[PDB]
Copies of this chain bind each other. A is one copy, B any other.
Amino acid sequence: TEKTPDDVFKLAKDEKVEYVDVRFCDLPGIMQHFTIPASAFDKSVFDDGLAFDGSSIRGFQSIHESDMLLLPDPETARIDPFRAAKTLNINFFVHDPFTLEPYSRDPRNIARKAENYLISTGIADTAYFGAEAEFYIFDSVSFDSRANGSFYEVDAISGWWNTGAATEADGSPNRGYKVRHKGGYFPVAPNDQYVDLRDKMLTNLINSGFILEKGHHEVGSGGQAEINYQFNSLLHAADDMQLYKYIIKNTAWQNGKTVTFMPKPLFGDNGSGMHCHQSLWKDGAPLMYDETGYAGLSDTARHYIGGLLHHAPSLLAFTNPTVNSYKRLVPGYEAPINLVYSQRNRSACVRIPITGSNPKAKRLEFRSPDSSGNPYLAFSAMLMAGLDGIKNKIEPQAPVDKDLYELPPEEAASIPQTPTQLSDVIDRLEADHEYLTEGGVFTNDLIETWISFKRENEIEPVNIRPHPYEFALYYDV
């Protein structure tokens, strides 16, 4: 957006950087990389780019499309706080060597195309995304899948399921303060056993350019935590999310822990979601506010919500893209499965934060997403769903501020739910994805690849493997 290639070279020189880490995003959502010496990092990298091979195998350029060209995004340049050798990390866009044409299956290109499409519609020129990803801090994790058995086990010294431990893992005495009490789930130390670690995470985020102001907090509940930061334009917000996960995971790693952003690592404890605040702006001014509308929402904002709610069944294929996503999105902890908007209900897919009369603070919050996938694709899909709602003036059903939990059974049957299985949302995406292909942001090719990837690599593998509970339930049949 505003950082110049020269700013990056200055950063590299001042920091005495010795290596540059070339990063790009894979299909499912994990950042990939290779390293080059800082001496090889010059103007030609920004002008001509870097050559590399379609490596590994699914999503990207196979051996009929092999070679790729990588072009850097100066706004993503950050000094790595973990690598011993001073390193500068930069994210790249994948292009076709010959035509210099942005590769259609590169998640970062999709996000860029989404931003350009927004501008082309004239509706707005900027889509701001604020995402809040919760995560769990564990001490260990082990699992396997064999012919005659299977298991998984996550553990934490201070886990509430360990109150009866005679001694700790390391032989030291059990000092308590593990129990999860009724009344409040954000107790101070010593009940809060991750204060210093979270502070290290926060310190690393701040040193890595994250902006923490107004309602940006660092919070923890048991082993779960969340550190929210200032929003950003679509693409860069997605880059920020990847950076956040990287910083959270490695700060924990360097401090003897292991973090997971999976939706539901614990059965009988809160899942981890990614609440996404969105809003459209044009010429430096907000487009979501209107004193006369419900919850201070403009016609643009309401139509956007109409798109999100209407497209949710397919949108979730990018927004909650894993089998584990549906262990969180299930009746219980006031799961955002109710296809309605509200200001009160937290079990509503879309919630409008109470921000008052300030037009610049008005935004909508899509609560259903989680961080088990690709933020570039998720944010883009959310924008496309919202834009389709604006273009077709889709009206969302009447908002609900009455507590959805205690509602007369016949009146509660009028509240649509989100699909409860990944195979479902994948089927829905396959059946209805035209809003995604608008302006060429998503291609049928990418969408078909995503559908195949999920079915073959996730849905089928889990489905063919007997679940442990099936033995409790059926060994005796």
Contact = CB atoms under 8 A, between A and B. Distances in A.
Contacts of A268: 147
* Main SS at interface, chain A: loop
A470 B327 contact: yes
User: How many copies of the chain does the oligomer comprise?
Assistant: 4
A232 interface: no
Contacts of A472: 143-145, 152, 163, 179
Interface string A151-194: 11111100111011110010001111101011111111111100
Interface stretch (A111-119, A255-263, A307-315, A435-443): A255-263
B33 A188 contact: yes
B466 A150 contact: no
A47 interface: no
Interface in A116-162: 139-156, 159-161
A404 interface: yes
A250 to B, nearest CB: 6
A327 B269 CA distance: 28
A461 interface: yes
Contacts of A51: 215, 354
Interface string A270-307: 00000000000000000000000000000000000000
Contacts of A190: 249-250, 253, 258
Nearest to A185: B56
Given A31-B188, A33-B187, A177-B258, 4 more contacts: A22-B217, A144-B164, A152-B471, A179-B472
26 contacts: A19-B199, A29-B183, A29-B477, A32-B187, A34-B217, A39-B213, A40-B213, A56-B186, A62-B403, A63-B347, A66-B343, A83-B196, A84-B199, A140-B175, A141-B175, A143-B164, A143-B471, A144-B468, A147-B161, A147-B266, A147-B269, A152-B468, A179-B472, A190-B250, A322-B470, A462-B473
